[PDB]
Write a protein that binds this ligand. Structure first.
Ligand code: BCB
Ligand code: BCB
Ligand code: BCB
Ligand SMILES: C/C=C1/c2cc3[nH]c4c(c3C)C(=O)[C@H](C(=O)OC)c4c3nc(cc4[nH]c(cc(n2)[C@@H]1C)c(C(C)=O)c4C)[C@@H](C)[C@@H]3CCC(=O)OC/C=C(/C)CCC[C@H](C)CCC[C@H](C)CCCC(C)C
Ligand SMILES: C/C=C1/c2cc3[nH]c4c(c3C)C(=O)[C@H](C(=O)OC)c4c3nc(cc4[nH]c(cc(n2)[C@@H]1C)c(C(C)=O)c4C)[C@@H](C)[C@@H]3CCC(=O)OC/C=C(\C)CCC[C@H](C)CCC[C@H](C)CCCC(C)C
Ligand SMILES: CC(C)=CCC/C(C)=C/CC/C(C)=C/CC/C(C)=C/CC/C(C)=C/CC/C(C)=C/CC/C(C)=C/CC1=C(C)C(=O)c2ccccc2C1=O
Ligand code: HEC
Ligand code: HEC
Ligand code: HEC
Ligand code: HEC
Ligand SMILES: CC(C)=CCC/C(C)=C/C=C/C(C)=C/C=C/C(C)=C/C=C\C=C(C)\C=C\C=C(/C)CC/C=C(/C)CCCC(C)C
Ligand SMILES: CCCCCCCCCCCC[N+](C)(C)[O-]
Ligand SMILES: CCCCCCCCCCCC[N+](C)(C)[O-]
Ligand SMILES: CCCCCCCCCCCC[N+](C)(C)[O-]
Ligand SMILES: [Fe+3]
Lengths: 332, 323, 273, 258
């Protein structure tokens, strides 16, 4: 039922406003240990010999690396994505230039996506960056992805209940609730807001009085947009293991300036980045995936805030490998 | 200590009294029975109950509304009885999610909600008639009915008057445990934080005052139960030492006092004002104010605070930012 | 000066401390020793509010705000301008409230009545302590307490709630809200009823105890009775804070997640999961 | 353009704000606070001598009189002139305006301070249908003690000093509300009966404990006119007597507890 004291608390607004984090140490420790499994950087290698564009036969992304540099990458990729499966997950034992296994082609696009993240989305990932490990955590299927309908459990490494299974219709409300921090909000924030750029998150008017011409009847946004934004915010908070005051002074959710923390701006960039990733890198990959990876509408698994963050306000508590693997970005 | 104020030490039994009303004396059904444990903290007699036309009409319409809600709820769990009990709190009947304006919504998107709203409203009106006419039948003033009227009026405000004034049924209160709760935040978020709505403030002021008054009034009467202060009607018409001491306790404490009758007017007025203030607030919201916080800023009332972590510009307004 | 019936009650005695020294009235107000301590604390607190408010940005009453210290000062004294005034004012408040309660027991004794009213007044003093003293002790800073300002204290209630994503799902809150609602409803019913019996209108004659019970038996099939509604009303009102205090004390010290998630004890039973 | 805007930086909600305060203060000041004054007004000063004309504020603070039509005949009008006639056996302890009064005699018999009774009608309170409301069980023979509960009839009454003071002979019941309000008891060694409000009674299974008065003080409990019914003023006299004991039964009860 309850969590024993003490609680760790932080301050994120002026004194007296009750803004800041409330954290259970046990829970933080369990997440710290889970995230400390991040494999350490492989030892640096001397840049020696010709570029692998001249040495190997089918190297389209990593072509400016030397042989030892490139094989160091391939070791790191195997550690991050398929340590249990090994190099043969993506490769033919007898022909390392064969694209015959689908993980090869996907991994190539993932290489491009990852460098895109570290080069074009520094407004969100800063100097910390991502690697394949950030999402994959040592398995080819990342533990936290989303379909065009809610699935349970959130961690696909756990085995679903009959009711949790997406085909059991009697369990839909619970599948939806657990994605919105157990609220009864009747909206799926992922397909509404993170799958594409079609919907506006902001719903609150920016004037005191209602403007004539947007304020009556069918000119009005339905109230459901406000439910939906709230649902997105429940989901976002739960995905970072935090509460609203991490980003907002609830005195005025819609105001910036002194009424928002810098984390709110970073979160804003995060919404745009996730949209780019899903629309332009992850959703097109239903062409290249087996039918057992796709959802009930032939969609590929896509990313939300939890995919990288897994319940922590900084993924892997700020761990970085950017300086150790320049080939993953940023790219000049 | 006066143990009588905690519970009845020695209970009494006697023949059941029936005060005759101008009509309906035969529509009292049931046989009275007595509960000894109830009788410790209250009156031991349960029943009979009057059973007029308006009361049955209320039960009729109410059950219809309940049934429409429960059926839609069960549809939400594909009629699995076990998941229905599990998920009961999270199940609901929703007004339209899409913007149809004031057009009648499809049954699958708000029509059933509108239906359940109609029958609940009829049930409330029917019960109101019961509350009113029962008073006149027994030769009593209609004070309760006018308080109850304000409470019904507030429900109509959040249920359909405010939707029709802004012109969208999408703004009604859903039916269900958690979902009617969720509406409060969706609404407050839409209209710019309800803490900054002065009529929220008024309503809360009166609601808190109802707690203050009933704690204070209840405590007062119990403190003068030894002189019979609970027999309030005859203390109104013939002031006894009970209400003299009650009046002097307050006068010597706060500098002024009520009478045994006027304290009930205070209480009645405070109760009424919870609902009247709430209704003015909803009637103004959406029709004439869009963001209550900005409205308080416009009129120079909102507090401001220093930044703690750095002030943060809206990134969407920086040059070259994506949409 | 005096109500027509007042003089025969204006007798010596009933004090708790000081005997005759403070046993007197000033206008309608009984004084007593706690009358004196109350005025002391009120004068001190209002002075500190005034001094603190003048060192602040504005004089608009809606925007004045005396705030507690940053969390980093823990449970220690903080500099006057940045939390100290809040600390001082808080102590005056407690002095004033407790003095006020004890003054009411003295008035009760002199009149030979029950102490029920100061007893009831303990509940809101207790709730004030839950918010400003006990819960900040359990968390380790006075910084978690609420600020003194007409509108600013609402911003604290606001953010405090959203620190647990949706406070409405707090079970102690649900209980508290339910008593606030039913208490306001009962007071309307009780006041409505009394007035309806004494004021039927039209020159009709005033009715009776039996009419009172007949009305509620007729409408809802039960009538708790005259004395009992007063006991119930004190019970209902008191439980707004008595049950609410659990939902407040729990948040932070005994629960750190959102309050919706707390209901997983029900939702996640394996039997129907 | 804006819904709710008016000329020169006014909007409708701003006006309603003012109107709402005006409504509140009107009802509170001009209505409720005058209703509050239908008892005990006009106030009493160190002799209000101006018999020729009333002072203006005393007229302004009062509501128009209202008349109650009583259920068993009669009318009451409030407010009205009701000075307290009876001589009070109290003396001013000082010259100050709000200094307390002191009892000159025995305050329980003299009915001052917490022992004061109101001057209610010397009238028996009545049921809906005219009968006496508060009657002992010997008269109210269709009323019983509920099965479960002490029958006090026969039990002794122990006073504050631990002395048995009498024996409970009957319970008086409210026939309108089905609720016992008094015990009747014979005071031992005095050949008379006394009534006790239940609220002063600690009902145990072998005794009735009564802490408000001493055993000897049961002798001077106000007596009733009739044996089998009570008037509203008598109810006040009886109830007040024990309440006066809370402060007066012993010299130490009026002084500070600390
Ligand atoms: C945990 C949640 C709390 C809460 C949540 C809350 C909400 C959500 C709202 C209020 C509102 C109010 N609160 Mg607040 N509050 C207040 C006082 C107030 C008033 C400004 C106002 C109406 C109160 C009322 O009518 O009650 C009933 C009592 C009555 C009717 C008797 C009259 C009391 C009088 C009107 C109070 C005036 C007090 C003075 C302004 C302050 C003292 C000044 C000094 C110098 C003498 C005090 C004095 C305290 C203390 C000492 O604990 C307190 C604590 C809390 N409030 C907690 C922090 N309160 C409302 C408001 O409009 O604020 C702007 C409002 O919407
Ligand atoms: C984040 C969102 C919040 C919010 C959102 C909110 C909204 C949107 C509205 C309120 C309203 C109100 N809020 Mg507020 N609120 C309140 C208190 C209050 C109430 C005093 C007031 C009136 C509601 C009421 O009494 O309904 C209880 C009584 C009701 C609902 C009447 C029911 C009567 C009916 C006849 C009952 C009959 C039922 C049938 C028997 C059953 C049949 C059912 C079947 C058929 C299905 C406090 C004390 C606080 C604190 C401490 O923070 C707070 C904070 C919040 N409120 C946050 C700001 N609140 C209302 C208001 O005043 O707005 C100006 C309002 O409209
Ligand atoms: C977004 C955040 C929200 C929120 C956050 C919230 C928090 C954080 C807390 C509450 C609490 C409470 N909320 Mg809740 N809330 C409530 C109702 C309530 C109250 C019943 C309850 C107790 C308030 C309290 O502690 O007063 C305090 C009042 C005090 C201490 C009175 C002190 C008086 C003092 C002894 C004397 C003062 C004297 C003056 C200074 C003297 C001046 C007088 C002059 C005239 C001379 C309603 C009805 C609603 C609706 C309709 O939505 C609502 C929504 C919300 N609440 C939002 C969801 N609420 C409290 C609770 O119980 O939670 C379980 C609480 O801690
Ligand atoms: C500030 C003003 C307050 C206020 C005032 C007032 N509120 C009143 C009156 C006043 C003056 C009445 O005169 C009337 C009444 O009659 O009281 C005895 C009444 C009402 N307020 C109810 C509920 C409520 N008030 C709420 C709030 C506020 N109100 C605000 C706070 C809330 C909240 C907070 O959500 C709720 C849920 C119902 C009990 C009742 C209507 C039943 C009905 O409309 O029928 C609807 C028809 C049905 C079939 C529903 C059946 C179930 C219900 C519980 C009815 C069952 C009764 C039945 C007799 C049981 C038989 C038992 C028997 C076998 C032994
Ligand atoms: C469930 C229990 C209920 C309940 C019960 C009862 N309530 C009682 C009694 C009972 C039984 C009395 O016997 C007593 C009284 O006599 O009635 C006239 C009283 C009283 N209830 C008051 C206020 C009240 N009740 C509230 C709530 C409930 N009550 C709940 C609902 C609320 C809110 C917010 O809800 C308020 C504001 C005063 C009017 C009065 C105390 C006067 C005092 O104490 O004098 C002493 C103090 C002063 C005169 C001023 C002191 C100034 C200090 C030093 C400096 C200010 C500091 C302050 C903290 C700053 C705050 C700023 C602000 C904007 C944040
Ligand atoms: C200057 C100096 C040295 C003075 C010394 C003396 C001294 C200690 C003075 C104190 C000065 C102070 C601090 C005064 C402030 C007084 C205060 C706190 C007033 C608060 C008033 C408020 C807002 C009350 C809210 C409650 C409210 C709306 C009450 C209105 C209705 C009333 C009067 C209710 C009280 C009341 C109740 C509850 C009954 O049940 C009852 C039953 C039968 C008869 C009368 C009553 C009755 O009067
Ligand atoms: C999927 C996540 C892979 C794992 C595990 C391993 N490799 Fe890989 N490899 C992968 C891709 C998508 C590519 C193409 C790279 C590009 O820039 O286009 C490669 C390439 C190679 C090569 C060069 C082969 C050639 O074209 O001649 C070699 C030699 C190679 N990979 C070796 C290698 C080893 C030894 C691995 C286990 C340590 C390994 N790879 C894992 C995808 C994936
Ligand atoms: C989150 C932003 C990711 C990062 C960074 C990387 N990957 Fe990824 N990958 C991600 C998703 C959501 C998916 C879809 C689920 C799926 O299993 O397809 C994938 C998929 C792959 C695959 C295919 C594996 C399979 O389907 O069995 C491979 C081989 C893969 N990803 C490799 C890979 C590499 C090498 C990465 C770093 C260069 C990398 N991914 C980053 C999410 C994310
Ligand atoms: C940071 C990681 C956040 C947390 C935790 C919460 N919110 Fe949020 N919110 C955040 C951003 C970046 C934005 C802007 C979205 C955009 O695309 O522009 C928002 C927006 C809102 C809004 C809408 C405000 C408007 O202009 O209409 C609301 C009402 C809101 N947020 C509320 C809210 C609540 C209640 C939260 C805790 C449950 C919460 N947010 C968390 C960033 C972050
Ligand atoms: C991997 C591709 C990510 C996805 C998807 C999302 N985030 Fe992220 N975030 C990521 C990194 C590598 C970092 C850097 C950590 C650091 O040390 O700077 C971040 C940072 C944030 C922050 C800043 C938190 C802070 O303490 O300063 C926030 C508020 C944040 N992220 C929010 C957020 C949201 C709301 C997302 C979904 C829209 C989201 N992130 C996705 C990596 C990735
Ligand atoms: C002209 C026509 C077509 C349109 C106008 C129709 C009209 C007047 C519509 C009005 C609609 C209104 C007033 C809607 C208001 C709805 C509101 C305020 C709903 C609020 C809360 C609902 C709740 C809490 C319902 C929960 C439902 C359940 C728990 C299932 C029902 C079962 C029950 C046992 C009910 C118990 C409720 C409670 C006593 C515990
Ligand atoms: C809007 C509510 C309409 C409900 C109609 C059904 C109620 C019937 C009223 C009968 C009243 C008869 N009467 C006056 C003798 O009590
Ligand atoms: C609880 C919300 C209370 C907010 C109170 C704000 C009221 C502002 C009214 C302003 C009156 C108009 N004017 C001219 C003085 O600005
Ligand atoms: C926010 C709700 C406002 C409620 C206002 C009720 C306050 C009662 C004022 C009592 C005034 C006393 N007196 C003697 C000056 O009239
Ligand atoms: Fe009463």
């Amino acid at each position: 039922c309850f969590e024993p004291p003490p609680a760790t608390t932080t301050q994120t607004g002026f004194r007296g406003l009750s803004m800041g984090e409330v954290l259970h140490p046990a829970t933080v420790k369990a997440k710290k240990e889970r995230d400390a499994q991040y494999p350490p950087a492989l030892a640096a290698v001397k840049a020696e010999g010709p570029p692998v564009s001249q040495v190997y036969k089918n190297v389209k992304v990593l072509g400016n690396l030397t042989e030892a540099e490139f094989l160091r990458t391939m070791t790191a990729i195997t550690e991050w994505v398929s340590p249990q499966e090994g190099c043969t997950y993506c490769h033919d034992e007898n022909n390392l230039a064969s694209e015959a296994k689908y993980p090869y082609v996907v991994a190539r696009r993932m290489l491009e996506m990852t460098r895109a993240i570290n080069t074009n989305w520094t407004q969100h990932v800063a100097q910390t960056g991502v690697t394949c490990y950030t999402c994959h955590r040592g398995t080819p299927l990342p533990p936290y992805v989303r379909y065009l309908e809610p699935t349970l459990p959130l961690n696909n490494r756990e085995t679903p209940t009959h009711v949790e299974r997406v085909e059991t219709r009697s369990g839909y409300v619970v599948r939806l609730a657990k994605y919105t921090a157990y609220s009864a909000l009747n909206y799926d924030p992922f397909t509404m807001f993170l799958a594409n750029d079609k919907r506006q998150v902001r719903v609150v008017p920016q004037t005191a009085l209602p403007l004539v011409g947007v304020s009556r009847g069918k000119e009005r946004r339905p109230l459901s947009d406000a439910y939906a934004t709230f649902a997105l915010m429940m989901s976002i908070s739960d995905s970072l293991g935090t509460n609203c005051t991490f980003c907002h002074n609830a005195q005025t959710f819609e105001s910036w300036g002194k009424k928002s923390t810098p984390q709110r701006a970073i979160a804003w960039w995060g919404i745009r980045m996730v949209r780019d990733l899903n629309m332009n890198y992850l959703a097109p990959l239903n062409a290249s995936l087996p039918a057992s990876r796709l959802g009930r509408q032939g969609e590929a698994p896509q990313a939300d805030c939890r995919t990288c963050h897994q319940g922590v306000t900084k993924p892997l508590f700020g761990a970085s490998r950017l300086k150790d693997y320049p080939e993953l970005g940023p790219i000049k | 200590a006066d143990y009588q104020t905690i519970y009845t030490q020695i209970q009494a039994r006697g023949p059941h009294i029936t005060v005759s009303g101008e009509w309906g004396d035969n529509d009292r059904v049931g046989k009275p029975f007595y509960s000894y444990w109830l009788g410790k903290i209250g009156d031991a007699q349960i029943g009979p109950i009057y059973l007029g036309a308006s009361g049955i009409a209320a039960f009729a319409f109410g059950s219809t509304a309940i049934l429409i809600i429960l059926f839609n709820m069960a549809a939400e769990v594909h009629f699995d009885p076990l998941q229905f009990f599990r998920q009961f709190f999270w199940l609901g009947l929703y007004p339209p999610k899409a913007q149809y304006g004031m057009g009648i919504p499809p049954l699958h998107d708000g029509g059933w909600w509108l239906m359940a709203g109609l029958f609940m409203t009829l049930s409330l009106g029917s019960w109101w008639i019961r509350v009113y006419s029962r008073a006149r039948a027994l030769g009593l003033g209609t004070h309760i009915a006018w308080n109850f009227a304000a409470a019904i009026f507030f429900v109509l405000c959040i249920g359909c008057i405010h939707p029709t004034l802004v012109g969208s049924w999408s703004e009604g209160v859903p039916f269900g445990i958690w979902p009617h709760i969720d509406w409060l935040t969706a609404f407050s978020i839409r209209y710019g934080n309800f803490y900054y709505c002065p009529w929220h403030g008024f309503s809360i002021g009166f609601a808190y005052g109802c707690g203050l008054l009933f704690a204070a009034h209840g405590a007062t009467i119990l403190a003068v139960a030894r002189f019979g202060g609970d027999r309030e009607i005859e203390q109104i018409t013939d002031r006894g030492t009970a209400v003299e001491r009650a009046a002097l306790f307050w006068r010597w404490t706060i500098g002024f006092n009520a009478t045994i009758e006027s304290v009930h007017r205070w209480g009645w007025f405070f109760s009424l004002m919870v609902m009247v203030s709430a209704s003015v607030g909803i009637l103004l919201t959406g029709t004439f104010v869009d963001n209550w916080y900005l409205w308080c800023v416009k009129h120079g009332a909102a507090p401001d605070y220093p930044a703690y972590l750095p002030a943060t510009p809206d990134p969407a307004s920086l040059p070259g930012a994506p949409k | 000066a005096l109500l027509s019936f007042e003089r025969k009650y204006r007798v010596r005695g009933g004090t708790l401390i000081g005997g005759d020294l403070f046993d007197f009235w000033v206008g309608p107000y009984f004084v007593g020793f706690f009358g004196v301590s109350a005025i002391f604390f009120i004068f001190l607190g209002v002075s500190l509010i005034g001094y603190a408010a003048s060192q602040g940005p504005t004089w608009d009453p809606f925007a004045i705000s005396i705030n507690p210290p940053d969390l980093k000062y823990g449970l220690g004294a903080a500099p006057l301008l940045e939390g100290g005034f809040w600390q001082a004012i808080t102590v005056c408040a407690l002095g004033a409230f407790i003095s006020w309660m004890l003054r009411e027991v003295e008035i009760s004794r002199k009149l030979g009545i029950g102490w029920h009213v100061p007893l009831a007044f303990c509940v809101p003093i207790f709730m004030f302590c839950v918010l400003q003293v006990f819960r900040p002790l359990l968390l380790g800073s006075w910084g978690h307490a609420f600020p003194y300002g007409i509108l600013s204290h609402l911003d604290w209630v606001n953010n405090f709630g959203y620190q647990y994503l949706n406070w409405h799902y707090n079970p102690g809150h649900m209980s508290s809200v339910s008593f606030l609602f039913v208490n306001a409803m009962a007071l309307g019913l009780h006041g409505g009823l009394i007035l309806s019996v004494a004021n039927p209108g039209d020159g009709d004659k005033v009715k009776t105890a039996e009419h009172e019970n007949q009305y509620f038996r007729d409408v809802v099939g039960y009538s708790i009775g005259a004395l009992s509604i007063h006991r119930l009303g004190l019970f209902l009102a008191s439980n707004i804070f008595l049950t609410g205090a659990f939902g407040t004390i729990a948040s932070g010290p005994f629960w750190t997640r959102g309050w919706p998630e707390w209901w997983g004890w029900w939702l996640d039973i394996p039997f129907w999961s | 353009m804006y819904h709710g805007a008016l000329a020169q930086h006014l909007d409708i909600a701003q006006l309603v704000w003012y109107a709402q305060w005006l409504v509140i203060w009107t009802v509170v000041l001009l209505y409720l606070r005058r209703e509050d004054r239908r008892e005990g007004y006009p106030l009493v000063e160190p002799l209000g001598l101006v018999k020729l004309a009333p002072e203006d504020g005393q007229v302004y603070e009062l509501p128009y009189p209202k008349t109650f039509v009583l259920p068993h005949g009669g009318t009451v009008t409030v407010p009205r002139r009701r000075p307290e006639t009876r001589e009070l056996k109290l003396a001013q302890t000082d010259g100050f305006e709000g200094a307390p009064l002191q009892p000159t005699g025995n305050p329980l018999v003299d009915a001052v301070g917490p022992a004061s009774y109101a001057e209610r009608a010397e009238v028996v309170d009545a049921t809906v249908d005219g009968k006496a409301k508060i009657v002992p069980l010997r008269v109210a023979t269709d009323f019983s003690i509920a099965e479960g509960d002490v029958d006090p009839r026969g039990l002794p009454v122990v006073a504050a000093d631990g002395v048995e003071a009498g024996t409970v002979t009957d319970l008086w019941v409210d026939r309108s509300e089905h609720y016992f309000r008094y015990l009747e008891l014979s005071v031992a060694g005095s050949a008379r009966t006394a009534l006790i409000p239940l609220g002063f009674c600690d009902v145990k299974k072998d005794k009735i404990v009564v802490t408000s008065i001493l055993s000897e003080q049961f002798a001077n409990v106000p007596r009733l006119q009739s044996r089998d019914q009570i008037t509203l003023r008598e109810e006040d006299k009886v109830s007040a007597y024990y309440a006066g004991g809370l402060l007066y039964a012993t010299p130490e009860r009026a002084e500070s507890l600390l």
